[PDB]
Amino acid sequence: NLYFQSMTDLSAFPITKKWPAAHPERLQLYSLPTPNGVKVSIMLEETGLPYEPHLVRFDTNDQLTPEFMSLNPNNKIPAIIDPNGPDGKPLPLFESGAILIYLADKTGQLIPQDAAGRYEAIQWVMFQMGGIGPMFGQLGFFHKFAGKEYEDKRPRDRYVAESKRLLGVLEQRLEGREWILGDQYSIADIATFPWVRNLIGFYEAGELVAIQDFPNVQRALAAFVARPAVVRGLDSPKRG
């Protein structure tokens, strides 16, 4: 490398031993099409940023490998390495909500550019990250995944009540608004609607929460799922 640049080398990141980069000039996404993974693929599809997706398979415990954990020591998807990071260096990152803020800043898309609006966006991303995701996820556990040994439905009922409470927050926020921040679709929507979708789809919790009681949520969710970039992001990484 005396006279010119090498092709992008990501070998400093041990995760690349397990999922080699065919396109090391592109952001590398290590994910699975779950509500948290699709936040990031949807963001990438919306913004048009090139990326190389890699399927992290739970059936083979891929997320528990040293290779995966070298990128995310929390053992969870999604995670990224952007080869074209700040200060001209690769940037590893995990936590879906952090990735959304990073990506919005990188190219100045899908976050308000005024300061107050930016902090409001971060607030609603935090609401999702600390409320929607954790609590809808616990309902999914107790309704869908928990076996017959959990005979007591009190934990389920706790998370039904909390999920309804959170849906009510969203419902009131969306009154008179197209999207969570008003007219402009943003990372707050990308963080939140995949979880509403999962709750009432995959988790089969739509009857428990009575989704029809939240007409603004139903409006915005229907709009969200129909966006072509959302449809693309929901199917990435490809399972086959």
Place this chain on the structure above:
Amino acid sequence: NLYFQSMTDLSAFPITKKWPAAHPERLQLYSLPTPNGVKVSIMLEETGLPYEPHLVRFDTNDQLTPEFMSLNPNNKIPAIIDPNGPDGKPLPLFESGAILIYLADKTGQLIPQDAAGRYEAIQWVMFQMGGIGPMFGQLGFFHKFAGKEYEDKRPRDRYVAESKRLLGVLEQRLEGREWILGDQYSIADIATFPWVRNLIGFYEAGELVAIQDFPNVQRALAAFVARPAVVRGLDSPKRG
């Protein structure tokens, strides 16, 4: 107001009907000394930013009032109004992790100033907001608050296992590091250590998680609780 500035008027914010501002030139904090509330009071005490604390009492359901909910429609503490906000206007904000990022940016303290470091800080705040807080909180419910009607200890055991897993992430991260981001104490520490403290103190879950198995965590926690600004922040708002 023809010839000069009025004293700061926060009357546009209905929360001020319930907790009037004696010092409307200061950031207004609506909180209670819980792990999430003290993140913000600790940050304020660390940075030296003036603030006026207001005790939001759960015994009188203050957080469920229209006045409180006009600021945080999610009905939770902490929440703030900074009268001296971006663009010279007051800034309302909720979600502890969002407030921490706002405050660090406002005065350029306790977040790295280089881009990569900033995103790493946001990542670890997200780890706390989506992992530590929600999961330690569910353990607190099932261990401390849940009554005898929850005879099945399977939910408790689920959150014990998850809390131990999260403590292990923190433990490995702190190996060879003073604080979560290395040498420099930051908002990542402020977000996280109040929750470790609460888990092993108020929640009485220290035996369940065997805190002594996490010597780096014990080191950093002991350092954290001894900081004079932490001691001040843990006692704000004052209950009497």
